[PDB]
Amino acid sequence: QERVQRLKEECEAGSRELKRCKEENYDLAMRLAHQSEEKGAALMRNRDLQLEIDQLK
């Protein structure tokens, strides 16, 4: 009777929330990849800086 209606409305609301949750997940994964690249770059800029310091010792 009415239980089909609330259930379909609940499934629509949950499905909508699941779609935006997966979009957030994709964005967080992309942001995590960007920070790993930026971290990797900063560490290697310090490997270069360190090696150059060691030679002028």
Ligand X SMILES: CNC(=O)[C@@H](C1CCCCC1)n1c(-c2cn(Cc3ccccc3)nc2-c2ccccc2)nc2cc(Cl)c(C(=O)O)cc21
Angle at the Cα of 37 from the Cα atoms of 55 and 41, rounded to 5 degrees: 15
Q: Which amino acid is at 24?
A: E
- Tell me the two tokens of residue 26: 């994709």
Residues in 7-36 that interact with a second copy by CB under 8 A: 7-8, 10-11, 14-15, 17-18, 21-22, 24-25, 28-29, 31-32, 35-36
Query: In degrees rounded to 5, what are phi and psi of residue 41?
Result: -70, -45
Residue 2 has φ and ψ, to the nearest 5°, of: -80, -25
Q: Return residues touching a second copy (CB under 8 A).
A: 3-4, 7-8, 10-11, 14-15, 17-18, 21-22, 24-25, 28-29, 31-32, 35-36, 38-39, 42-43, 45-46, 49-50, 52-53, 56
Q: Return residues touching ligand X (CB under 6 A).
A: 8, 10-15, 17-19, 22
